[PDB]
């Protein structure tokens, strides 16, 4: 209706004003503020583990996998390289321009390899064991696996580049993908066709254009939105779908219909799931009920401190690997809330209660559209790469001053 | 001496109390539908709907006071596939807004002009073509259906200065254009290239093509003249095959291009002599940016005056206009009239003032 | 220097914001009797208990309705609730302009 | 009054805008103020990181009952649910009951209850009666106790049915570009008059006002008794649209409508290099130099003010070797001659147009130029029968070099093929 | 000194018949 359109316009105006307000709290809450606007709109993010800090160049060679989610103009797959201020940050150093601590000019966000894609790029999950290979999800029934080394750079004015490795196991459009850090290969994808499909990958055949699905997990009644493995144990993973069940499935269980863990864990739609390597028991999951709840593997029936801070469906959750009791979540409410456990179930001052739950520690509000993906940096302590639907990729580090003394 | 007699019926005023420039009737309303007219002024545009028995009522009002906006033109048109009237307003920032009173919401905005739009007219055969004369020393033709710039009239030898106003021929084949360069240069739309461009714009799709629409820059006009008007010209009409352009000389000269016996459609571009045939003379009409609108039947031509008087003319009797005709005076006419509009049936005439105070008249009929 | 580009906000949303503020102030008196940081209300005796009273509160989905003893009702008939203490489930129903999902109509999943 | 009143209204309008901006922040904050390092006065909770993640467990029937006083009646249930994504409004399920011939102006509770449903409520119909059985916060309500349950029109004096219900010195100075000031006090300890925030001291107040409120700026000056602040909105406020600039000039009904993905130019932004993590300083209360790369704006065409799309950038040269108006002017100038021949005029026009279209400047290349006509324009000369004029012009070279006799012979022989081919 | 800032200032957003009387209904915008 006309009133609905006017309300949406007012909402967009207020979102813009809130984002403008949030931009001002960059230094007092973050260590670095790096936001890059990709030409092709970003739908996913990742952090390559490559690093290089040469003498005389204090920056570290950091690579991040961007995305491409425009309708159809020679669809690509962007891979760029970024830097880091390092210990010698040198904010001014009387010579900042590149800066005195890292590259602040010329190739700040320069693109290294741009392999052409066929359709849309949903996820850009790579294999940490062999960072050369990168998998992609497309609206078609097949997945795309590329290689930024073998494929030439400087794309020609053409399209439909052959990735030499297409994983065709799905039926409808997909939106999930995850690799196995423990074992090279073993990529699984959760799609919209009420199921999650996994590929063996690993030692894929040379020029393996046609790749069938090694395994398919069809146990959720409603549409799935994420599928993530377990860092500590590679023999199980969790499947989360719109059906009110953040199910966890153990691999090699000879049961593709009944998940090992069948606890509902919610009364509404659920669209996110992840765990923590340092804290194996900690496992945050996102949901439409705006009540993302931490769970323990040993005791899942009992409900721990449900972080009552979301306001919409949550599509992406991830706990910080380096720390011990740090978790985070993001979804359609365009907020990246970072949880905490030390303050959970403990007394607090009335101001702390007014600010929110003590367990909720950090919340990131630097998005205008729905959050597509977010991930911590394996090398840097607090650097996080979060992306939205407004073709904005954000690289920032949560301030560690709160964890002082 | 004339056979017409209009009488004042009703009048009103606007909330914003600012000068009103452009006022036109809804000629596209057929019989049975009561007359409806619009008016502009300041940052708040207003409509009106006056019934019989000397009663005027307000239908709708709008406002655009978000920024320092202004409005000058109130060209009337309609949508063929929708069949609701539309009103065109532009100025200040130069954005052309197509207001839809039926749904009470703007339909389209046009940007690209280097300054404020001064006048607007609509093409008779195809009601979706708008003649926009911008102040950036150029004139442009807009296709409303596709929202594309059909042609940019002006260039190497076109529109040395701002084009104040422009008109259309009776059949829509030849286009006149006055301006501030003391020039009555003319751009025909009769060339085969004009037809090709119009057809391409009709079957154009900006989404389909990556390249921008190839507008036809008509640098060289087909016919231009300077000697007719010593000063800048701000009004022009097409009395059949003749020209009824008007300037600040308190006269609307009725002239014909070229010699006497030569056909107008066969005039060579190199012609450099003009002849004057008619000239309607009044007084106290030396202000700038004021427009006149004649009746559809061409028997009536009216031009508002700054003092407050009104003039009507007879343009159908044998030989060009002569004698003195008659003048219409209102009891409460104190401001400056900037535009006048008749109805499709020659029975209703409304004159706007410099305070958005419409004065509707009615003929005996 | 170059002036501000344009006021993206408050072009037309200002009137809607004013209307919502007027409605909230009239209905709840949050800024009138709620001290500026809590939701005020006026309760009426919807029912009672043999002895108490049921001092139901007028703003639905804004101020929850509870029970009060006869002396308790007669003394604290009016109850003011802190905004962060307000229920989150009915927060969306309290006002529709606090959070609206624009791109959730299509795409999304 | 009058002019003063108009100035007061013109001051209140931006003040009103700031008020509406601040009201929404009150209802739903964006980020926690606890984690504001500079504003450490508020939420100064103790920090103990020794709490390991292994120890989360330790760390954490009614007998009711007459008639209306001043007719079969039914009792229905009204349910409110959570606003899901699929359904904008909360689904409602109705579970009515039977009717009995109760006297006109003279019950046992069922196990319908006992977490999709937010709450359970019951409403009477005797001709309607809505009751709040459960609170919005799931608080205890509708407990034991009998009274006159009044029915809403369309205990109380209105009609009711008897039922035996049972269990189950801080100062401010508002300004506008230093126009005029104001005198306003404070209510709570370092409370912001715009939004509810209980700051402990001025450290958590001034920093929050400067950073968390970008709409208006502050000039903290301190007071002998409390804290004195000045409130005013800065002129610049670069808070325009932060998304795709392409949607800024889009047509109404489609701008920022979020219909689908929109292509744009690449850009990178850096504005916070490294916080100094310094200490509190009074002089702070009493440059940015951001880093950007790539294209972060929307470009325009050269010919007019039409916005240049990012896709319209592959070539987009808009710079031609020989513009069309130049060709038209050259043709007009050639045709305007009075002492030239028709075939001569045609051949000179052709040569001038070819020179303009090719832009030959090297002297030796001029020789090769005489060949080009034969490759391209020989058919026109043959059809127009301008061979003699061509030969005369070609011979008219020695006055200014431009090839020699051999080239003349070669070209004349070459066009001889066209004339004989046509013949 | 109009006491609490809210009651004398924040009445500008509700500038209609919703000020709940008090000092807002009085000459709060003026002197």
From Swiss-Prot, chain A:
It comes from the Eukaryota. Changing residue 389 to A: Decreased interaction with ZNF827. There is a cross-link at residue 2 (Glycyl lysine isopeptide (Lys-Gly) (interchain with G-Cter in ubiquitin)). The modification N6-acetyllysine is found at residues 2, 154. Expressed in neuroblastoma cells. Changing residue 225 to A: Decreased interaction with ZNF827. Its main location: nucleus. The modification Phosphoserine is found at residues 104, 349. Residues 1-126 are annotated as: Interaction with ARMC12. Changing residue 33 to A: Loss of interaction with ARMC12. There is a cross-link at residues 2, 154 (Glycyl lysine isopeptide (Lys-Gly) (interchain with G-Cter in SUMO2)). The keyword Cytoplasm does not apply. Changing residue 41 to A: Loss of interaction with ZNF827 and loss of localization to telomeres. One of its GO terms (cellular component) is CAF-1 complex. Changing residue 122 to A: Loss of interaction with ZNF827 and loss of localization to telomeres. Keywords: Acetylation, Cell cycle, Chaperone, Chromatin regulator, Chromosome, DNA damage, DNA repair, DNA replication, Isopeptide bond, Nucleus, Phosphoprotein, Repeat, Repressor, Telomere, Transcription, Transcription regulation, Ubl conjugation, WD repeat. The keyword Iron does not apply. GO terms for molecular function: histone binding; histone deacetylase binding; RNA polymerase II cis-regulatory region sequence-specific DNA binding. Belongs to the WD repeat RBAP46/RBAP48/MSI1 family. Binds directly to helix 1 of the histone fold of histone H4, a region that is not accessible when H4 is in chromatin. Subunit of the chromatin assembly factor 1 (CAF-1) complex, which is composed of RBBP4, CHAF1B and CHAF1A. Subunit of the core histone deacetylase (HDAC) complex, which is composed of HDAC1, HDAC2, RBBP4 and RBBP7. The core HDAC complex associates with SIN3A, ARID4B/SAP180, SAP18, SAP30, SAP130, SUDS3/SAP45 and possibly ARID4A/RBP1 and ING1 to form the SIN3 HDAC complex. The gene is RBBP4.
UniProtKB/Swiss-Prot annotation, chain B:
Its main location: nucleus. This is Polycomb protein EED. Residues 5-365 are annotated as: Interaction with EZH2. The modification N6-methyllysine is found at residues 121, 192, 208. Residues 73-227, 225-365 are annotated as: Required for interaction with the matrix protein MA of HIV-1. The lineage of its organism: Eukaryota, Metazoa, Chordata, Craniata, Vertebrata. The modification N6,N6,N6-trimethyllysine is found at residues 121, 192, 208. Induction: Expression is induced by E2F1, E2F2 and E2F3. The modification N6,N6-dimethyllysine is found at residues 121, 192, 208. It comes from Homo sapiens. Changing residue 117 to N: Impairs interaction with EZH2. The WD repeat domain mediates recognition of trimethylated histone peptides at the consensus sequence Ala-Arg-Lys-Ser. This is achieved through an aromatic cage encircling the methyllysine, and involving Phe-21, Tyr-72 and Tyr-289. Methylated. Binding to histone H1 'Lys-26' promotes mono-, di-, and trimethylation of internal lysines. Keywords: Acetylation, Chromatin regulator, Chromosome, Disease variant, Host-virus interaction, Methylation, Nucleus, Phosphoprotein, Repeat, Repressor, Transcription, Transcription regulation, WD repeat. GO terms for cellular component: chromatin silencing complex; cytosol; ESC/E(Z) complex; nucleoplasm; nucleus; pronucleus; sex chromatin. GO terms for molecular function: chromatin binding; enzyme activator activity; identical protein binding; methylated histone binding; transcription corepressor binding. The keyword S-adenosyl-L-methionine does not apply. It is found in: Nucleus; Chromosome. It comes from the Eukaryota. Signal peptide: none annotated.
UniProtKB/Swiss-Prot annotation, chain C:
Signal peptide: none annotated. Residues 18-84 are annotated as: Interaction with SUZ12. It comes from the Eukaryota. It is found in: Nucleus. The modification Phosphoserine is found at residue 1. Self-associates. Associates with the PRC2 complex, which consists of the core components EED, EZH1 or EZH2, SUZ12, and RBBP4, and various combinations of accessory subunits including AEBP2, JARID2, PHF19, MTF2 and EPOP. Found in a monomeric PRC2.2 (class 2) complex consisting of at least SUZ12, RBBP4, AEBP2 and JARID2. Within the PRC2 complex, interacts directly with SUZ12; competes with PHF19 for SUZ12 binding. Interacts with EED, EZH2, and RBBP4. May also interact with RBBP7. Belongs to the AEBP2/jing C2H2-type zinc-finger family. Acts as an accessory subunit for the core Polycomb repressive complex 2 (PRC2), which mediates histone H3K27 (H3K27me3) trimethylation on chromatin leading to transcriptional repression of the affected target gene. Plays a role in nucleosome localization of the PRC2 complex. This is Zinc finger protein AEBP2.
Curated annotation (Swiss-Prot), chain D:
Under hypoxic conditions, the precursor SUZ12 RNA undergoes regulated trans-splicing with the JAZF1 RNA, resulting in a chimeric isoform which may be protective against apoptosis. The chimeric transcript is characterized by JAZF1 exons 1-3 joined to SUZ12 exon 2-16. The chimeric transcript is expressed primarily in the endometrium from late secretory and early proliferative phases of the menstrual cycle, but not in normal myometrium at any phase of the cycle. Its expression is slightly induced by low levels of progesterone, but suppressed by both estrogen and high levels of progesterone. Component of the PRC2 complex, which consists of the core subunits EED, EZH1 or EZH2, SUZ12, and RBBP4, and various combinations of accessory subunits including AEBP2, JARID2, PHF19, MTF2 and EPOP. Within the complex, interacts (via C2H2 zinc finger domain) with JARID2 and EPOP; JARID2 and EPOP compete for SUZ12 binding. Also interacts with AEBP2 and PHF19. Forms a monomeric PRC2.2 (class 2) complex consisting of at least SUZ12, RBBP4, AEBP2 and JARID2. Its main location: nucleus. A zinc finger (C2H2-type) spans 190-213. This is Polycomb protein SUZ12. Induction: Expression is induced by E2F1, E2F2 and E2F3. One of its GO terms (cellular component) is nucleoplasm. Residues 297-373 are annotated as: VEFS-box. Sumoylated, probably by PIAS2. The record marks 14-15 as: Breakpoint for translocation to form JAZF1-SUZ12 oncogene. It is found in: Nucleus. The chain holds residues 80 to 689 of 739 of the full protein. Overexpressed in breast and colon cancer.
């Amino acid at each position: 209706d006309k009133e609905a359109a006017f309300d949406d316009a007012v909402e967009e105006r207020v979102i813009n004003e809130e984002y403008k307000i949030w931009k001002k709290n960059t230094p007092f809450l973050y260590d670095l503020v790096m936001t890059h606007a990709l030409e092709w709109p970003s739908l996913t993010a990742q952090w390559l583990p490559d690093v290089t800090r040469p003498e005389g160049k204090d920056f570290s060679i950091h690579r991040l996998v961007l995305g491409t989610h425009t309708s159809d103009e020679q669809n690509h797959l962007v891979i760029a390289s970024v830097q880091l201020p390092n210990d010698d940050a040198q904010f001014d150093a009387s010579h900042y321009d590149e800066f005195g601590g890292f590259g602040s000019v010329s190739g700040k966000i320069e693109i290294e390899i741009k392999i052409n894609h066929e359709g849309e790029v949903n996820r850009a999950r790579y294999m940490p064991q062999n960072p050369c290979i990168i998998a992609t999800k497309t609206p078609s029934s097949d997945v795309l696996v590329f290689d930024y080394t073998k494929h030439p750079s400087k794309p020609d004015p053409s399209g439909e580049c052959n990735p030499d490795l297409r994983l065709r196991g799905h039926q409808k459009e997909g939106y999930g993908l995850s690799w196995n850090p423990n074992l090279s290969g073993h990529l699984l994808s959760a799609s919209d066709d009420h199921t999650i499909c996994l590929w063996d990958i690993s030692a894929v055949p040379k020029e393996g254009k046609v790749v069938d699905a090694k395994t398919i997990f069809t146990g959720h009644t409603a549409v799935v939105e994420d599928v993530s493995w377990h860092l500590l144990h590679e023999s199980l993973f969790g499947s989360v779908a719109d059906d009110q069940k953040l199910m966890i499935w153990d691999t090699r269980s000879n049961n593709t219909s009944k998940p090992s863990h069948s606890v509902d864990a919610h009364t509404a739609e659920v669209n996110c799931l992840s765990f923590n390597p340092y804290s194996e028991f900690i496992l945050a999951t996102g949901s439409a009920d705006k009540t993302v709840a931490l769970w323990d593997l040993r005791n899942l029936k009992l409900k721990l401190h449900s972080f009552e801070s979301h306001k919409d469906e949550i599509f992406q959750v991830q706990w910080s690997p380096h720390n011990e009791t740090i978790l985070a979540s993001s979804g359609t409410d365009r907020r990246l809330n970072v949880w905490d456990l030390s303050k959970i179930g403990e007394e607090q001052s009335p101001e702390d209660a007014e600010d929110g739950p003590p367990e909720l520690l950090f919340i990131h509000g630097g998005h205008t559209a729905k959050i597509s993906d977010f991930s911590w940096n394996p090398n840097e302590p607090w650097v996080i790469c979060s992306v939205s639907e407004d073709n904005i990729m954000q690289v920032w580090q949560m301030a560690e001053n709160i964890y002082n003394d | 001496k004339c056979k017409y007699s209009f009488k004042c019926v009703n009048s009103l005023k606007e909330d914003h109390n600012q000068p009103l420039f452009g006022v036109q009737f809804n000629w596209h309303s057929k019989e049975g539908d009561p007359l409806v007219f619009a008016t502009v002024g300041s940052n708040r545009v207003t409509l009106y709907e006056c019934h019989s028995q000397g009663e005027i009522r307000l239908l709708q009002s709008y406002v655009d006071a978000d920024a320092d906006e202004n409005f000058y033109t109130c060209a009337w048109t309609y949508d063929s596939n929708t069949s609701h009237p539309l009103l065109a307003v532009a100025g200040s920032r130069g954005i052309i807004r197509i207001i839809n009173p039926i749904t009470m919401q703007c339909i389209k905005h046009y940007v690209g002009h280097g300054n404020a739009i001064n006048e607007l007219k609509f093409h008779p055969r195809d009601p979706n073509l708008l003649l926009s004369v911008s102040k950036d020393h150029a004139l442009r033709l807009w296709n409303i259906q596709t929202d594309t710039l059909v042609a940019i009239f002006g260039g190497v030898e076109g529109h040395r200065d701002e084009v104040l106003s422009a008109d259309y021929d009776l059949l829509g084949e030849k286009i006149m254009s006055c301006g501030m360069d003391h020039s009555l240069k003319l751009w025909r739309i009769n060339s085969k290239r004009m037809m090709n461009a119009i057809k391409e714009s009709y079957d154009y799709n900006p989404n389909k093509t990556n390249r921008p629409f190839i507008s036809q820059k008509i640098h060289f006009p087909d016919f231009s003249t300077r000697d007719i008007h010593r000063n800048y010209v701000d009004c022009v009409r097409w009395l059949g095959d003749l020209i009824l352009s008007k300037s600040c000389e308190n006269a609307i000269v009725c002239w014909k291009p070229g010699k006497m016996e030569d056909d107008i459609d066969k005039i060579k571009p190199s012609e450099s002599n003009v002849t004057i045939l008619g000239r309607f003379d009044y007084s106290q009409c030396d202000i700038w940016y004021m427009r006149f609108s004649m009746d559809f039947w061409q028997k009536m031509l009216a031009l508002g005056n700054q003092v407050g008087k009104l003039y009507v003319w007879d343009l159908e009797v044998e030989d060009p206009h002569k004698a003195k005709c008659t003048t219409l005076t209102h009891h409460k006419c104190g401001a400056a009239i900037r535009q006048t509009s008749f109805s499709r049936d020659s029975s209703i005439l409304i004159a706007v003032c410099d305070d958005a105070s419409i004065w509707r008249w009615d003929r005996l009929r | 220097s170059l002036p501000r580009p344009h006021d993206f906000f408050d072009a037309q949303t200002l009137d809607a914001i004013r209307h919502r503020a007027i409605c909230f102030n009239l209905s709840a008196h949050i800024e009138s009797l709620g001290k500026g940081h809590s939701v005020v209300f006026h309760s009426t005796v919807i029912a009672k208990r043999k002895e108490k009273l049921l001092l139901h509160w007028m703003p639905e989905d804004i101020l929850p309705d509870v029970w009060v003893n006869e002396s308790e009702r007669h003394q604290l008939k009016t109850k003011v609730v802190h905004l962060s203490k307000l229920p989150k489930d009915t927060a969306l129903l309290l006002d529709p302009n606090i959070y609206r999902t624009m791109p959730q109509k299509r795409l999304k999943r | 009054q009058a002019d003063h009143e108009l100035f007061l209204q013109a001051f209140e309008k931006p003040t009103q805008i700031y008020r509406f901006l601040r009201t929404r922040n009150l209802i739903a904050p964006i980020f926690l103020h606890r984690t504001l390092t500079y504003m450490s006065h508020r939420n100064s909770r103790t920090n103990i990181k020794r709490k390991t993640f292994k120890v989360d467990d330790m760390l954490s029937h009614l007998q009711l009952t007459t008639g209306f006083f001043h007719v079969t009646l039914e009792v229905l249930l009204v349910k409110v649910c959570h606003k899901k994504r699929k359904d904008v409004s909360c689904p409602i399920r109705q579970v009515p009951t039977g009717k009995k011939q109760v006297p006109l102006n003279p019950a046992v509770s069922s196990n319908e209850f006992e977490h999709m449903v937010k709450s359970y409520s019951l409403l009477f119909r005797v001709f309607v009666a809505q009751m709040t059985v459960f609170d919005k916060n799931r608080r205890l309500q509708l407990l034991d106790g009998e009274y006159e349950v009044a029915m809403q029109e369309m205990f109380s004096q209105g009609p009711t049915l008897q039922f035996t219900l049972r269990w189950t010195r801080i100062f401010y100075q508002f300004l506008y570009n230093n126009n005029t000031r104001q005198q306003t006090e404070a209510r709570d300890d370092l409370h912001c008059p715009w939004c509810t925030l209980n700051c402990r001291k001025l450290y958590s107040l001034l920093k929050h006002l400067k950073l968390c409120h970008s709409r208006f700026i502050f000039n903290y000056v301190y007071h002998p008794k409390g804290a004195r602040i000045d409130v005013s909105i800065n002129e610049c406020y670069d808070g325009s649209y932060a998304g795709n600039p392409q949607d800024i000039h889009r047509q109404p009904g489609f701008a920022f409508s979020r219909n689908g993905p929109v292509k744009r130019t690449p850009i990178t932004h850096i504005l916070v290099c490294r916080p100094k993590r310094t200490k509190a300083s009074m002089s702070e209360f009493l440059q940015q130099r951001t880093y950007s790369s790539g294209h972060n704006r929307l470009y325009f065409h050269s010919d007019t003010c039409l916005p240049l799309r990012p896709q319209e950038m592959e070539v987009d040269s808009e710079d031609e070797k020989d513009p069309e108006w130049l060709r038209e002017k050259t043709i007009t100038q050639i045709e305007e001659f009075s002492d030239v021949n028709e075939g001569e005029k045609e051949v000179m026009k052709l040569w001038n147009l070819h020179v303009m279209k090719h832009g030959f400047i090297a002297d030796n290349q001029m020789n090769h130029a005489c060949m080009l006509f034969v490759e391209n324009y020989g058919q026109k000369i043959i059809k127009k029968n301008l061979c003699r004029n061509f030969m005369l012009h070609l011979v008219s070279m020695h006055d200014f070099n431009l090839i020699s006799i051999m080239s003349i012979d070669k070209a004349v022989t070459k066009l001889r093929e066209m004339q004989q081919k046509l013949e | 000194p109009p006491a609490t800032q809210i009651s004398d200032l924040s009445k500008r957003k509700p500038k209609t018949e919703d000020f709940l009387t008090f000092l807002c209904l009085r000459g709060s915008p003026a002197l």
